[PDB]
Design a protein around this ligand. Sequence first.
Ligand SMILES: [Zn+2]
Length: 46
Amino acid sequence: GSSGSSGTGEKLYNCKECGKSFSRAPCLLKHERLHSGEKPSGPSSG
Ligand SMILES: [Zn+2]
């Protein structure tokens, strides 16, 4: 019963794919994007 979030953005950075809590938020947010399925085969254009 102690609900109270100080701020404007009520979001908690945390990877659910592999399940790992990084120390750096910035790096964590990017880590969540790194989880793009399996075998990221880009377009390889050019
Ligand atoms: Zn992860």
